[PDB]
Amino acid sequence: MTDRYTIHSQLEHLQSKYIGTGHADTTKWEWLVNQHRDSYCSYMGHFDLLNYFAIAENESKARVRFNLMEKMLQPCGPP
Amino acid sequence: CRRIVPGQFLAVDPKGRAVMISAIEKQKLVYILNRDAAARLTISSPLEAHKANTLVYHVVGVDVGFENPMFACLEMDYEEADNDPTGEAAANTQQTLTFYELDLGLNHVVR
Amino acid sequence: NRFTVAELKQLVARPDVVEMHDVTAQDPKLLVHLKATRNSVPVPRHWCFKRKYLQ
Amino acid sequence: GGVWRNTEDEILKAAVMKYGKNQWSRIASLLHRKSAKQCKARWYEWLD
Amino acid sequence: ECLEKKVDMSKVNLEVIKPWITKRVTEILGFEDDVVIEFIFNQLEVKNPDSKMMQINLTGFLNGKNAREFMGELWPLLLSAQENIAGIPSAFLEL
Amino acid sequence: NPLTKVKLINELNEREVQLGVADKVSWHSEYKDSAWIFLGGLPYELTEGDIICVFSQYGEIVNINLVRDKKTGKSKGFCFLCYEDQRSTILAVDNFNGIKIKGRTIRVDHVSNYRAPKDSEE
Amino acid sequence: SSESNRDRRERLRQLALETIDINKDPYFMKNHLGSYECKLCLTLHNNEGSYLAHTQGKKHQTNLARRAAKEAKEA
Amino acid sequence: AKHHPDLIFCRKQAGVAIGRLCEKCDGKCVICDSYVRPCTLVRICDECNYGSYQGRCVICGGPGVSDAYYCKECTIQEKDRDGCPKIVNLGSSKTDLFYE
Amino acid sequence: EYKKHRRTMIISAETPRTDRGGDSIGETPTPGASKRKERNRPLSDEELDAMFPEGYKVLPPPAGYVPIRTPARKLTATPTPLGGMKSVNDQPSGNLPFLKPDDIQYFDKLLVDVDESEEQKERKIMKLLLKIKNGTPPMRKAALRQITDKAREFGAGPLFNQILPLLMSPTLEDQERHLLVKVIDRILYKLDDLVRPYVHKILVVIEPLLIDEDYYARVEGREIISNLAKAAGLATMISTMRPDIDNMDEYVRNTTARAFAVVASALGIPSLLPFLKAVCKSKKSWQARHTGIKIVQQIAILMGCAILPHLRSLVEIIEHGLVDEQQKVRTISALAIAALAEAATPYGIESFDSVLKPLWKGIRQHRGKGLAAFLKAIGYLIPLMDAEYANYYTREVMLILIREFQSPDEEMKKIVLKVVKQCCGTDGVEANYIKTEILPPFFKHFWQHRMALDRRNYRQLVDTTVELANKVGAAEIISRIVDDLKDEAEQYRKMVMETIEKIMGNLGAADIDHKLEEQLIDGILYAFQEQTTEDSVMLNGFGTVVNALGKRVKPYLPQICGTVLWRLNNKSAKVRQQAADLISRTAVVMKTCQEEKLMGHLGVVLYEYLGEEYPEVLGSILGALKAIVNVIGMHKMTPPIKDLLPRLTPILKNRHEKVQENCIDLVGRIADRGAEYVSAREWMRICFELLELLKAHKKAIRRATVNTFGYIAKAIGPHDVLATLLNNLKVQERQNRVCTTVAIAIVAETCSPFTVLPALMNEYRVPELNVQNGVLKSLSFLFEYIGEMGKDYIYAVTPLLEDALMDRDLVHRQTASAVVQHMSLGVYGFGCEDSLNHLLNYVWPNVFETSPHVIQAVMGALEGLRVAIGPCRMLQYCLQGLFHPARKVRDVYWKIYNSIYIGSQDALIAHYPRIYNDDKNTYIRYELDYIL
Amino acid sequence: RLPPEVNRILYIRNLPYKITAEEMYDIFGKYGPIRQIRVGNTPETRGTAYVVYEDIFDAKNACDHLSGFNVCNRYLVVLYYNANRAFQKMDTKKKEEQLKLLKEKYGI
Amino acid sequence: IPYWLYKLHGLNINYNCEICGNYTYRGPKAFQRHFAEWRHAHGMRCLG
RNA sequence: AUGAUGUCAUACUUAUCCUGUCCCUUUU
RNA sequence: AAGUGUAGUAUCUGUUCUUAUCAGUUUAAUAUCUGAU
């Protein structure tokens, strides 16, 4: 397995460990996916927001919760 | 209400010995409750259970009769499908029940 | 490889905010969609200057 | 020391022009780098 | 690479691979060493080991070409043993 | 640990010299009422009379005793010597403690407790 | 020391102003940040020495001779 | 820190321990590096205080006397809810000072 | 002698293994032939050509000199007793400071004055190490900067090849070693991958820095080793540290152990777990298992609480070691188990259970130091056990402890002390049985005039006495320790005093009897009467004793007062210093006991002795006066404020450290509390005097000066204080120069800022850049100190900040960003959105900048604006920069976006605009468009 | 009865390029047998050299006696040889032959 | 011959302006000025 | 007519900083 | 006619590219750098 790719750390650089901290080489797909995931998490967080979003459809709160948790994986599309 | 911000899931074990707080992803803390000499519920330091690329669907407490307590969570892996331009690995990504045991002796959580 | 400035202006909805340095970008379509925002603030004129913005 | 810098040389020239040549302490009180002996030495050596 | 396929060291023996790995190390490393043999043995201790870390360790101990040889000798033998219903390769039955 | 005992003795002496220790508290109040000095770490090939003559430079020795083994040959490194006067014991602890002879240097201490055959340590 | 330092700085500024007046230099100008600037050299100077030292290098008087000849064609 | 930009904060998980600051650094803000307007108390890491590491100064690194607190400028800016602010590194300061 | 092995270090997996095998097969036949029957051994042509480097040629000039030197062996004996221009070359280049003769061999290449010759060019450019090591501080900083910038250019190979010998200099002083270590750290901070081949070469020089007496130097060595390990891979470091396990030199073994511990601390326990497990299972040699046990012990001691989860795994490494045949391996395993236990808080008792039974079994067959190691391990393991088994464990171990109480072994003594500290703290310890059995020997066998002399022995005895007093009782320990109060030994007296102080602080002296109280008083008196070394032991002890006695110390009050008076009449620095210290400490007890006549007499004596020239005595007198003013009231203090204020006024120019601190504290307390006896002209003179106190080399002095200026401002008025502060010409920009701005802010916080604002705005009109930057810094500090009070001054401070935002100078922009940060932090919720936007209009272009100070200020101001101006406007201003083409512009914008996203993670949903959906992507959040 | 700093090798600098090497060997032999004498054949090595005697005592005696000794027009500086610090160019190969020879000669 | 100024100021950079009457420009700022100038203005006007 | 270069001086900012220790190296 | 040290920044003085082209790295693009005529 001649790859020679040992990407762990070099000299204790900045190294953003936060999920969605953002970077310089962030492609448009990355920013869109991070934004969609953050918006889904926020919709799952705010109770009144969940009520206002699910009040549109006749589905129940659990229906919206399942539909939101299911859309977390690959919301935009395979890059 | 951040994605890495615990608060989306909170659980209490049946034995009343511990509590757990988990976010939508990339966060899991386990606080230990203990009775004091004056019956003061003292909150001990938390155990770190960071699981990267693991989205938690829900959390629940396992049944333990004064043994090593366990906490169950319906986890889903997202790191594999994050590098699948073909869109195939997005499918065949099944949620798994992860039961993490809080070893009272080791004082650390483990899968 | 690199799209033409004229092509990016023809494909853009608000090409009045197109720049010459945007043709060699990584996502010119995203840059055009962002620059035509409502309350979007632009970058300053020090992107190409050489006086350190205070000389 | 006595590096004999350029700005120090100009200051010494101005002092010899305005203050004078027979006033080494008056020039050393505005240099704060060398002594009046060193100041007069630089004046008689290079700043003459 | 051949070490890119997922394996499982729990579904195979260890004594059958001990002397083969020992001979491979004595041939590549030349001399007789106990740290390398014990390191290679403890490397396959987990139930779901990783071949990348094993290859990195072999490259650190070996030269890098002998490391590739050791990886390409240990990966397919272990894969064939894990594939065997009894849990061993074709060499364990020959002698 | 084994050779650090001489280091500890030398450090105690140096601290008493540097801390301004007086004559009444000069690491001798504890070893008083008995001049039985315990020497240890000596080599296994040391003779009794040779060690007696060596430690006799600081005065006359009253009663020396080397660690005589059951069948080994009296080669243990430990030894207990009650000298003539306690002043000689203090002088030996001050000068002869940590001296180098026959290769490996040995250590010296003041016990002043009893006549223990098995009390030292390798 | 400190007050002596302020007195020395004031005396140095006075000597520099006297030198600039004796030379009748137009370039030396006092800045709004307590500094000197040479418009002829088009440069800055932190201390009075750097402002008075704009006569050895960057002899822009030759570059001003061009404007002098452009304003008047006759020599 | 503003005085020591080459310092590395611990950023460890928070515990149930209350820390203290050295007498020489009494009152100095742990994060803001100010000298007025404290809001919240400083929480030490679990591994940041175990025996010999117990009772040390957060910023000064020396023996602590007074209990420290986070600066209000750091509390209002959502900065006090960060990891363990223990100065693990010690460099570019008090290195050659012992030689003098 | 042990460190001398470091002098025998030479520079530079299969070939190393064969070399180690050859070393062993060369170290065997030497004693082989020795039993069968040096550095000056024979030399070979290969050895000769290998010893020296290139640049030399062997040349015996004639055919007669070789056979002239061949019989030189016999020519040293028979014929030895018998009948029998202005050139020089130093090393100057342009300055090139003086190179010592020992450094002449190292910097010899620079001695050649040749110039203009590439590889030799780089080698000569690497001669800056000479200026770095030997030279002035500015040249040192310049060489450091050049090495930081020229890392990849000079190449890591030559840098290491030139730095390693300098580290091996036998004449390398402490400062030279510190500079070389700092240079190595700076080089390792930049070079990451290139440090792999030089791993062993750097470790061979860096390891001895860990094994050293200097605590700071050991910390620097540990940090450098950790950085070197984190740079390269754990596998490479493991391969480098592999052959050091079976090294003949035990010092090499200890160095490798410390290195493995540092590598585990950096790369983590489990990363080095299996390597250690393989090292422990090595049946090759006992030295291997010894090195492994030592590595485990060092890793535990360095990691502390990090061994909690892997502890069971560590037990798997340590379980097979307890059965070691060689006593050294068993002792190392016991020490490792004890380290893992004592370093671990109570947890994982089961993980150690496998080691529980044999160790106690070894206690049965314990003989010699092995018994001591087993006792230490049992003491470490006792608290980890539960009460049921702990009862039997302690009952069994106490007999062996009492039997070993008379051990002459100092190591056995320390082990017994640790076992007593661990076991006596157990709930299953019998108090009466303890006092009957362990107390008298602990007082006789443990407490001795020789044990206290040691360093570790002192702390061990203190901890043991504290634990025994807390367990069995305070009265017994007090009765045992009070007899030594008259000890001639100063160190023993200090130890007894510290023990009594710790006992009184922990248990409380209420259990002290009347006879015990009198004995303790006599002991404290004898101790204060005999104090040779200047130490806070006696002072802190007297203070704690007085605080514990309370009203019961009234009968001892007059004796203490008489002793203090006699010591004030005694030698000043020797006696009166401690006298004033005791007075300042017991002021609280003297005021509590209603020592009115005593307080007045003390005040009179203080007013009399205030004229002493000794700074050590004068400072203590000033501190005692401050304590008396703290206990005795202002109007009730017999030395009235009318005499104290003008008398303490000219004392500010004492120039001493403690004197200046005490005078500042006294003046500040008098001006903050009373603020009445000081006249207006008196306050003005005090301010004119305190203006000169800001030039000190301390920070606490500056803080006290600011506080005193604020008190004087609150007392007299704002106008005069602001006028006296406005005259700050700021000769130096450092040495508490901004301190004038801090004082202006303190006065504005104490006084009406309506008065301080326009005066500062007018003083900002001055031309001097120093004055302008000072006005900006003072405005920033004032806004930060005011906070909520700035709801009115926002519109007034807007235009000055907007004008100063024009980047005429970097310091001006830095002060502007700082003022903006303070204002945004202070205007939270007060309704200053318009001023925030007006300030951001000029603060936004400051994002493009390279100044570290300016960049930090701009980042802080952006954070403050996001806090107050809100993240919506922040993202609206930082939106276009995200997908910009450039590298620097994209970097700055990404830093701003990461700062805005670190917080406000919830509010980033709405600010995220609607980006159109591409072909293979649906980014538009259609759910947000759900119209109810 | 001497410091560890003293070693058999000694670096002699501050010499000419065409230094009379026979007289140099004679001067070095005043101490003991010259085990080796390397003359710097390089430009920077031109004017510097190293010597190595078969005994440390004689070398130290000559270092004490020949400290900055007079020359035709100069005085070469003689210092104790520093550590090697550069041996990767060399290697310990072919030592197994010497080991086998030692094991065969004595037989042990 | 300030070739330093010629390279730093952006000189010696060829540019062709078909909107500016098919003209030449020796710099990027020169190109921006030629795209928006009286010559290019008249060209666009005559071109409609 | 802005700039790049870097020995060698100069102003500035970080409320920068003077009792800091071997309390922990006790390996043979 | 007195300041100590730790990191970083700017303004001053001295020097250099009329090299016509091709390819690459790099740059937003230049520039610089690397090889050939």
PDB file of N, CA, C and O in Angstrom, chain F residues 46-53 66:
ATOM      1  N   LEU F  46      37.084  -8.215  49.903  1.00  0.00           N
ATOM      2  CA  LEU F  46      37.791  -7.443  50.915  1.00  0.00           C
ATOM      3  C   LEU F  46      38.065  -8.304  52.140  1.00  0.00           C
ATOM      4  O   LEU F  46      37.213  -9.090  52.564  1.00  0.00           O
ATOM      5  N   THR F  47      39.259  -8.150  52.702  1.00  0.00           N
ATOM      6  CA  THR F  47      39.663  -8.886  53.890  1.00  0.00           C
ATOM      7  C   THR F  47      39.353  -8.082  55.149  1.00  0.00           C
ATOM      8  O   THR F  47      39.183  -6.862  55.113  1.00  0.00           O
ATOM      9  N   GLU F  48      39.286  -8.792  56.279  1.00  0.00           N
ATOM     10  CA  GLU F  48      38.974  -8.137  57.545  1.00  0.00           C
ATOM     11  C   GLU F  48      40.135  -7.274  58.022  1.00  0.00           C
ATOM     12  O   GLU F  48      39.940  -6.110  58.392  1.00  0.00           O
ATOM     13  N   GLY F  49      41.351  -7.824  58.017  1.00  0.00           N
ATOM     14  CA  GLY F  49      42.495  -7.069  58.493  1.00  0.00           C
ATOM     15  C   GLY F  49      42.840  -5.889  57.610  1.00  0.00           C
ATOM     16  O   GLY F  49      43.283  -4.849  58.105  1.00  0.00           O
ATOM     17  N   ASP F  50      42.642  -6.024  56.297  1.00  0.00           N
ATOM     18  CA  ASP F  50      42.895  -4.902  55.400  1.00  0.00           C
ATOM     19  C   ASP F  50      41.952  -3.744  55.698  1.00  0.00           C
ATOM     20  O   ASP F  50      42.383  -2.588  55.788  1.00  0.00           O
ATOM     21  N   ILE F  51      40.661  -4.037  55.863  1.00  0.00           N
ATOM     22  CA  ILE F  51      39.699  -2.993  56.201  1.00  0.00           C
ATOM     23  C   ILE F  51      39.997  -2.417  57.577  1.00  0.00           C
ATOM     24  O   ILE F  51      39.811  -1.215  57.807  1.00  0.00           O
ATOM     25  N   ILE F  52      40.460  -3.252  58.510  1.00  0.00           N
ATOM     26  CA  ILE F  52      40.815  -2.760  59.838  1.00  0.00           C
ATOM     27  C   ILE F  52      41.968  -1.770  59.745  1.00  0.00           C
ATOM     28  O   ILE F  52      41.938  -0.698  60.361  1.00  0.00           O
ATOM     29  N   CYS F  53      42.996  -2.108  58.965  1.00  0.00           N
ATOM     30  CA  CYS F  53      44.134  -1.208  58.806  1.00  0.00           C
ATOM     31  C   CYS F  53      43.729   0.066  58.076  1.00  0.00           C
ATOM     32  O   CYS F  53      44.250   1.149  58.370  1.00  0.00           O
ATOM     33  N   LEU F  66      32.814  -8.216  60.273  1.00  0.00           N
ATOM     34  CA  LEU F  66      32.384  -8.294  58.887  1.00  0.00           C
ATOM     35  C   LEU F  66      31.272  -9.324  58.747  1.00  0.00           C
ATOM     36  O   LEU F  66      31.122 -10.222  59.579  1.00  0.00           O
TER      37      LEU F  66
END
